[PDB]
Design an enzyme around this catalytic site. Sequence first.
Site, PDB file in Angstrom:
ATOM      1  N   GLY A  33       0.774  -1.219   0.000  1.00 47.85           N
ATOM      2  CA  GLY A  33       0.000   0.000   0.000  1.00 47.85           C
ATOM      3  C   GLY A  33       0.810   1.276   0.000  1.00 47.85           C
ATOM      4  O   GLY A  33       0.228   2.355  -0.166  1.00 47.85           O
ATOM      5  N   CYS A  91     -26.154  -8.516 -19.680  1.00 44.80           N
ATOM      6  CA  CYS A  91     -25.439  -8.299 -20.929  1.00 44.80           C
ATOM      7  C   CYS A  91     -26.314  -8.715 -22.102  1.00 44.80           C
ATOM      8  O   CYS A  91     -26.928  -9.785 -22.087  1.00 44.80           O
ATOM      9  CB  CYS A  91     -24.131  -9.084 -20.944  1.00 44.80           C
ATOM     10  SG  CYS A  91     -23.299  -9.036 -22.542  1.00 44.80           S
ATOM     11  N   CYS A  94     -24.141 -12.006 -23.943  1.00 41.39           N
ATOM     12  CA  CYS A  94     -24.035 -13.274 -23.232  1.00 41.39           C
ATOM     13  C   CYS A  94     -25.111 -13.470 -22.174  1.00 41.39           C
ATOM     14  O   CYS A  94     -25.348 -14.609 -21.762  1.00 41.39           O
ATOM     15  CB  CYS A  94     -22.660 -13.396 -22.565  1.00 41.39           C
ATOM     16  SG  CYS A  94     -22.485 -12.447 -21.045  1.00 41.39           S
ATOM     17  N   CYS A 135     -20.847  -6.665 -21.503  1.00 41.35           N
ATOM     18  CA  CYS A 135     -19.748  -6.849 -20.563  1.00 41.35           C
ATOM     19  C   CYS A 135     -18.547  -6.002 -20.964  1.00 41.35           C
ATOM     20  O   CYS A 135     -18.154  -5.969 -22.133  1.00 41.35           O
ATOM     21  CB  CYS A 135     -19.344  -8.319 -20.497  1.00 41.35           C
ATOM     22  SG  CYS A 135     -20.631  -9.427 -19.902  1.00 41.35           S
ATOM     23  N   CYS A 185     -17.078 -12.248 -21.470  1.00 34.76           N
ATOM     24  CA  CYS A 185     -18.270 -12.308 -22.308  1.00 34.76           C
ATOM     25  C   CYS A 185     -18.158 -13.418 -23.344  1.00 34.76           C
ATOM     26  O   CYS A 185     -19.131 -14.129 -23.610  1.00 34.76           O
ATOM     27  CB  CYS A 185     -18.489 -10.962 -22.995  1.00 34.76           C
ATOM     28  SG  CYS A 185     -20.168 -10.693 -23.579  1.00 34.76           S
TER      29      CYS A 185
HETATM   30 ZN   LIG Z   1     -21.603 -10.420 -21.767  1.00 35.46          ZN
END
Ligand SMILES: [Zn+2]
Lengths: 143, 278, 278, 250, 353, 353, 193
Positions: C31, C240, C243, C265, C271
């Site tokens: 970090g 989506c 898909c 996506c 996807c």
């Molecule tokens: Zn997708």
Amino acid sequence: ADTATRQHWMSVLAHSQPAELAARLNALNITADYEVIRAAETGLVQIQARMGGTGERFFAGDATLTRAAVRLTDGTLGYSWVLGRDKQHAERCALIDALMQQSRHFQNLSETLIAPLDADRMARIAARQAEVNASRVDFFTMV
Amino acid sequence: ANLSGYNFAYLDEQTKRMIRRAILKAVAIPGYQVPFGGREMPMPYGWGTGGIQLTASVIGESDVLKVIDQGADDTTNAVSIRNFFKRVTGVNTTERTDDATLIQTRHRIPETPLTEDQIIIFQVPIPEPLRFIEPRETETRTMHALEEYGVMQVKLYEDIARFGHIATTYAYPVKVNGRYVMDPSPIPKFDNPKMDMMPALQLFGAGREKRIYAVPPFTRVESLDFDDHPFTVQQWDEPCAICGSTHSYLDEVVLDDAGNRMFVCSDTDYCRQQSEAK
Amino acid sequence: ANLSGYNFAYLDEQTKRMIRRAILKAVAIPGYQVPFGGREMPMPYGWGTGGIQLTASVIGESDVLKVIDQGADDTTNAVSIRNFFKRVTGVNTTERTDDATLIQTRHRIPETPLTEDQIIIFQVPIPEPLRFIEPRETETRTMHALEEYGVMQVKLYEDIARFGHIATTYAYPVKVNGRYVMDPSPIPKFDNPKMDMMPALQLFGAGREKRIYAVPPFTRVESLDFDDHPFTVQQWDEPCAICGSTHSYLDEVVLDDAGNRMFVCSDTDYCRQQSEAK
Amino acid sequence: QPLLSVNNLTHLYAPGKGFSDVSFDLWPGEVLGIVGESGSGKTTLLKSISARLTPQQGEIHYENRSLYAMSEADRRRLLRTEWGVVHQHPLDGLRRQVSAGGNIGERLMATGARHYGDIRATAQKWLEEVEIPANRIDDLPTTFSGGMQQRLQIARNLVTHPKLVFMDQPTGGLDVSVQARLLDLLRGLVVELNLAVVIVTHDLGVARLLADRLLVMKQGQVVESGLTDRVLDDPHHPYTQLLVSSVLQN
Amino acid sequence: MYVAVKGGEKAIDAAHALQESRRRGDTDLPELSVAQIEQQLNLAVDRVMTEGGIADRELAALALKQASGDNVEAIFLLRAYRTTLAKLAVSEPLDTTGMRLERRISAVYKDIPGGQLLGPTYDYTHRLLDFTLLANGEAPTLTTADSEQQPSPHVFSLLARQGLAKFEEDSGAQPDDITRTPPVYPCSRSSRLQQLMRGDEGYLLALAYSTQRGYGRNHPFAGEIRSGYIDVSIVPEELGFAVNVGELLMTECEMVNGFIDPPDEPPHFTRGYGLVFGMSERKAMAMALVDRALQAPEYGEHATGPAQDEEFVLAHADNVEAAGFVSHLKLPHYVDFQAELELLKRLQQEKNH
Amino acid sequence: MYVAVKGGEKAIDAAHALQESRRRGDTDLPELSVAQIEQQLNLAVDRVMTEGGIADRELAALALKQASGDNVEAIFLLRAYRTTLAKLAVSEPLDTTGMRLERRISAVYKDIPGGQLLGPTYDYTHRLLDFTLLANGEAPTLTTADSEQQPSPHVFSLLARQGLAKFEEDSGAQPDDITRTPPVYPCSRSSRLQQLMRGDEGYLLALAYSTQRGYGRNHPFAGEIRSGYIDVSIVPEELGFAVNVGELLMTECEMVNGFIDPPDEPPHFTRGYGLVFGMSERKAMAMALVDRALQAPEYGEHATGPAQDEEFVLAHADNVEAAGFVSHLKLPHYVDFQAELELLKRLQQEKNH
Amino acid sequence: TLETAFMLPVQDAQHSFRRLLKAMSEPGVIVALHQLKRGWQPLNIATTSVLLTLADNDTPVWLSTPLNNDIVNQSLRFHTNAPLVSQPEQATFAVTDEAISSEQLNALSTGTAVAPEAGATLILQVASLSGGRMLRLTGAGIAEERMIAPQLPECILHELTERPHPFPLGIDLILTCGERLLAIPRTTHVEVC
Ligand SMILES: [Zn+2]
Ligand SMILES: Nc1ncnc2c1ncn2[C@@H]1O[C@H](COP(=O)(O)OP(=O)(O)NP(=O)(O)O)[C@@H](O)[C@H]1O
Ligand SMILES: [Mg+2]
Ligand SMILES: [Zn+2]
Ligand SMILES: [Zn+2]
Ligand SMILES: [Zn+2]
């Protein structure tokens, strides 16, 4: 005296224009076999300037620098460090430095190669000084 | 004669008319910075555009123009401006103050006293005397509007307390007609007294800052100071090395690296007069 | 194979060595933004120079490189970076997350979970999570040094009070190893949970800002939030359109001026997998 | 053993400006008032003992730990969790661009609080404690009056239930009613929660009603010290006698 | 004894001749033509046109040639020449929706009506010095697609129709013209935009970068950048009806900026606008960002950076004024410096004793 | 139904081809040569060399040609190429007293040892567009004077020998190099000067102009401006003695700034320093002015302008970083903008009900 | 007379760095640096590989007296050009053996809170990575816990188990035995079992 003379002729070679140097070297027709110890390499020289021109150092950018190293048959080492990126010019400068380190060539090249180059550079400087000095502002003449 | 292909004085009549209105307003409000729509001149901003525009708006065919920078007519920028005005107006030019009808100056008032019908035009980089105290125009406009000049008095008092003297040596603020605080342009304190009750009209042009302000003839111009710290002009222990005058502003000429130096009159015409007298 | 005339990965060995030391330090201090002497790359600053340098310093001949911008491999900048790395290293490339050994990403973490020995390199414009609160590095350095993160908590509290929600929707600050507050790069809040206890090493490079910071595998990464205002990821009412997935970050594609639009996506590889499954 | 110990503490901007050779011990559940002339170094001493001004000489030990030998992180942690600081000017101890609720809640969140509703409720409770209306929680301190800002700072530095509170004229800008409210609140905190307070004040009535022990400072040196009522009613050093003779009798 | 001599005029002429000779360079090389500068140095020409205030590519290239490539000097040349030209007409308001698009991109959506038209750009190029340009070469033969320009509605129109942003609405207010009246702060947004279009590219770029780094953040997104040809039309008094006078290559940039929550309407994105001559985009982007920064008074925003300081930003944005005033230090100043020397010497003497 | 298709690479190639074609321009006109740009556009080359960090005129001209005249793009090209080059040597400190003078002026005295050498300059020229440059012309035949360069001691040396100023004295401190270590604020004056030399000309010009207008005044005088050739020498390990490697055309500017009154020494003028490649002067003058402004911590000056803000000035001075980050907004940002849209839509819905 | 560095400096350095990154990011995992056939004795293969990969003119190197040898020093100067410092507090990389003392360990730079990367990295050559006191490692790089039994000095075990320094200050340890390497960053929490 060897160090100062070597510095002088290396400076003359570095400041010499590549074209005139090549033409003069070809005209001389110097026969000498040499091997390139370091192939001409173009990199950067870091520029150090001074605050107010005289004070603490600081890095004022970089500049292109080409370096070359050659060896003559007798083992003489010639070096060149020239601003710019002309690799052939650097190789020629290293060769001339090696030859100047030889007794048989030192005087001949000083009288025929280094001195004419320095004279030509001084003439070019003289001329541009004459042209630049015309812009000087005149304020007073002492009568 | 004007044969350069441009309009007389290089400015279109609309710009001349606007500048003339601004000049009249400035004359009516002495010491007040009158905004005006200044145009970009062939000279870069900060090289005397305001004075050039004022001269173009005021200059006529019969005028005799004197251009001085640092008090010298041969100064590079003075030569450039004079050549430009000759090209675009074809007016007569002189290096003699007493023969001049319009005087465009940068950082000097001639030693020779000015006369009636003469106009001296000042090139002003910073027309706001309070700018170095308050950099923002939004505040200085109100301060001038309300006569809130206390910050300038505080600055002078602090300068006296810190250094023992007022640090302003040129562009010394003045009070005009007892009311407006005005910047006299970067003339030295030496030339400030000349502004008081001057028979010649004074015009001030800041082209980059777009301000025009004027001091009418015979107008009170009093340098800000204190009774126990009176306004004092620059002084030198040496007279002019050419004419020998002791009452003229002197510029320092360095002769060699060793350290040799001389002092000569900044006003070249006054030096010529003084040398030809003796 | 590298046949471009440059050194492998285009970086000199000194720069690679310095970046490698910086990476090791960052891994040792999760970090923390490790300064490094970043060099100017063929890409302009702000176009992924830090990630490019990190990949060059870490990439090897046998590595399989996946480059994604906005989660898509075909994105213009992703294509440019991939072509550059192919030219200067000749490494194999893939669009499949599970086949990739090094993943250089901009603003997305792949939906496909990462595995051991995988390294995901993030392009970071602003490595300082407190920059938008305190623009000055002189102060944020001390704040990180002394764990003075109270200003961030104040910012979150004020956002909740003003809008009713935390206004940060991407580059959402996280706490790493319970100690350093870190910027996760401009990935959406959606991808922040993936950073927690991730088996793959995470590297972050801000070339313009000259910072490198890392999250080692299996390290706690907790998004800053409140119990009554828990960290919530972006959501959509539509799956989506290609898909049909409902668990993926969606980018909005505007189809026509009338108002028709679809959501697909952002992770193109995910996807593709989801469409080929059904 | 003392909660705070000061030994030969000295900080001088110039000869006579600041404090020199100051030593005293503060225990939990007591109030050490500091009274003195305007210019005696009370504020400089308060800053030095509150980790805001590194001394030139002497040592400060908090729970047996040298204050300035610790890391800067530890001192900031002290000032962030268990130390309260009330400045003479409230805006110096307040975030101008942060609402009153945020100003109070910063400390709470710094102590681990992470529930927005609870932080809001605590901030409203403390605003009502100092009699500030709970409807001003979302208003920036710039909209608050001087007394309102002072009370907001007091609540901010008391919300975390700290163990040590350094206050510089906390009653300044407060009407006598809210002043009595604050005095009762401080007494209750000191007795019930064992809070320790180092308070710089010029109102000798507030020092009488609140301070358990007193320091009297003049030209950067402690001239008289001891029990509050003994010092006020049986002063010994000339300055103290002048000071208590200058009180306006009501 | 010294006598004053005339040296100013001849020295000035010699300096000008030297500058002209250096500008010409080695006579062995052919002299540069203005057409070559206009065609092959088009971006410098674009900046010169934008800052100088004249949208004439030939004039900008001529100024660049006369300036030996100095952008500041060429810009000042063009501005000064602007002074010598009369204003024949005032164009009707430009309609950027009718632009013929050489380039059109949007960073806020993956795809938009009309598509992502990259056009001619150095974006995504690997900045490696192409040494083959040291010698003459053959330009690429361009590939072609269909010639129809698909509809390209402004992205901000799409945002506004969704309620996410506010339409920029014309109230009929007469624009302020700082070329005729000196600016008065606080300036109207029209005056601010006019000054920004004339402002230094580098200065505004630095200010926008500072805003991006928290110094007056506005959370910018490149909502849409459109570069192409826009028709210019006037309404001469001779005819009384609109006549189209030609087309100008212009670049327009619209930046979506952090949303606000107004008391009496839904929260919405703010916006910034930039408009320049030619294809150069960074100037337009910086213009939009600085315009958003200077819109702070209209939103009651607490300034956190110099870019939000209206007077500071605008009073020093015009490179003409700034460069002129910085270079004026090269003018003789020995009168003022002599005054300062007199004061300083007196102070040193006083302190010594 | 929609299916994803590959469009990135071919679109990028087409855009690059279009940019190259526009750079070449009309094939009827001959292609520009790098030598022509180097000789006749020398000032743009000077700026490119100064900001890009390489003092190679040919490389800067090549970058300008490749950048279609865009100074920012050429500067970035040169800097990126700097990355690919190895550091062969570190030059010995430059000795500006040994400069061969093309130009040398001083505004603090009317005349100085060595005289006022105007040299090649556009100063005092009437900025009128020279339309005769639209066609080929003959360069002026230069007049000549004596060729001796008179001694030209630095004006600041003259001031210091009088006690009016302090010599800049070398303590041997190793200069900081921000090209290898990222800057840490507050930076040393060496680092500040190194960054300023690389800073944007316009941004630093604007800052210096603001200082001249009261925003952090320093009362500047152009004490001396020297332009000319300085020899560069190195000390290679192969030989161990200094070797001169050539000469560089550089411009040095020394600014006299308002005097101070130190407690334990006579009051004296302060100073600012600027150093650039080539003949361009305004960059050096702005560098000196901003250096004086940033020297405030060493003098305990109460900052009154942004130019005195070290982090703000230096963090945004490099046009490489600023231009890159401003142009990066052109990159796709639809993921982040979608996050903001989701939040904004939720806020609008919440406020509606 | 000088030793031999990597046959392929670029590829070998990249491979060694990747192995070291695997080790450091996952404390307790042993990795092998097989690119270097022979180390610069008394330095082992892993220590020499790490020095060649990371050490350079910007990283001062301090060698403990047992490991300080003329041949090793000359080889390091020739191949890496890293300056050699006689005091551990001046070192960016510290190379020691089991004979390291607590004073030497505590003289190593731990960095500062604002610059925790300015500390030194300690390379410790262990007799084995396997035959010592069982240690349980938890923290970043470790899913639950890692059981490693390195043979360690008592000062080093003290450093690991106590952690006298406040994070982000710390020393990163690299235990090298032969061609195999183990990494323990300043974050790892170590318990003796
Ligand atoms: Zn997708
Ligand atoms: N920053 C400073 N620099 C130089 N001198 C200071 C500074 N601060 C205080 N002094 C002096 O230090 C002395 C004590 O300061 P301070 O502790 O603030 O006085 P005080 O007793 O709190 N006065 P009051 O607030 O009216 O009760 C005063 O003479 C101040 O003028
Ligand atoms: Mg006080
Ligand atoms: Zn005289
Ligand atoms: Zn001036
Ligand atoms: Zn972005």
